[PDB]
Symmetry: C3
Subunit: 165 residues, 3 copies
């Protein structure tokens, strides 16, 4: 696949989409749990966890999948895997890794264009909040995995896509 990263309000979405282009058929994997976009989304696009079920081997090369976003997906999983003070951050990481490996696998075998969106969350200062701190570590480790797995990697800054790989 293709991995797009960047800070909040970096324009990574727009860049991802720009990566999608027309693209005949487009599957949007919208990971946030609901605790304006759905409107700007072309009517043609479909909107959809249990991700490997979507990222299939029997798709078209002209087809395209957009997952938004990896971070969120990470978050949902911890909680799912889970109060965060009794948490064994270590075990959590591993499990998370399993999952990511699964995504990778799926993406690996998927004939469609796959574009994954994630965020850079650790160019800031060490947070005081443990989960927060934990969180940031795991997310970075997840990104490395994806990146390594990725074919192309972009970093978006101020809406400017920078192809790092």
């Amino acid at each position: 696949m293709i991995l797009v990263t960047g800070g909040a309000r970096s324009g990574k979405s727009r860049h991802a989409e720009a990566l999608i282009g027309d693209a005949p058929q487009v599957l949007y994997i919208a990971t946030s749990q609901i605790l304006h976009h759905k409107d700007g989304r072309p009517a043609h696009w479909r909107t959809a966890r249990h991700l490997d079920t979507l990222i299939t081997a029997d798709l078209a090369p002209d087809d395209a999948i957009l997952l938004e976003c990896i971070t969120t997906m990470v978050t949902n999983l911890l909680f799912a895997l889970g109060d965060p003070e009794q948490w064994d951050y270590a075990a959590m990481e591993r499990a998370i890794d399993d999952e990511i490996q699964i995504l990778i696998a799926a993406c690996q075998r998927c004939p469609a264009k796959v574009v994954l969106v994630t965020n850079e969350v650790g160019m800031g200062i060490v947070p005081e909040n443990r989960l927060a701190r934990h969180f940031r570590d795991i997310a970075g480790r997840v990104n490395q995995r994806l990146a390594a797995a990725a074919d192309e990697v972009w970093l978006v800054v101020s809406g400017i896509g920078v192809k790092i790989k």
Copy 2:
């Protein structure tokens, strides 16, 4: 124009300044409001290094009044910085109401207006125009309501500016990176 971004103490000020260089007449546009002796004391070093052929203005509204169309193509303008301006606008807007009770949707809409104007100005200005902004969203989601919103807002302003820019540079550890 040229857009220059980086985190705090990235060296973007100095890189910006380098972008301008030897220009005969320079106008430094300074958007900070000194709300402390600390904030004031530091602006000091800024001035202290400022040149004689550089005029300062202590402004952050209507730069359209500053970034002008009769300007000489050999002259330059350095605006420092977007983020402050944005922060300046945000509390203006906010008024004597708590940030809590703020209408970020509104504010952001009002914010875009002033940005649009700025872009137009920069677009119609024959002089070299450099703007300094900050990268503030490479970290963890902010607990504090505003902050969280200000971060969104900043990012959006950034995109626009960048979009508009003829040139963009990311400066890391004092190292300028031309991304556009």
Copy 3:
């Protein structure tokens, strides 16, 4: 010398270790003040000795050091932190603190100027987030950046590492 920067868990360390290579003899300078560490060691080669210090690096970064040998410093930000703490965080004279910090930076810098061995320093990007409410953190974050510029300016090669991907900026 080589400066490698990036954020927390950006794969900068791996990248760093990668610049080191099959460096026969390597000195690992761990600035962290003390389990998490237990393992770092654990995954550290045999022909690599470790020096736990964040002061007088000039004591380790020597002129006699063999070219084909290397130094891996990890990490600058930490060092910084300890430094500040060396010098109540509210009643701190930041301007002064910072100057001392730079004194130590200059040492480090001159040291790497005459060390014939490969010197790699690892630091982090920490000013790409929002302005902190905490006054130390604000200053820390401020000192941290100035320190990076100096090093970067001193370094021969500068790499920004993103999501495990290395970007050569200098």
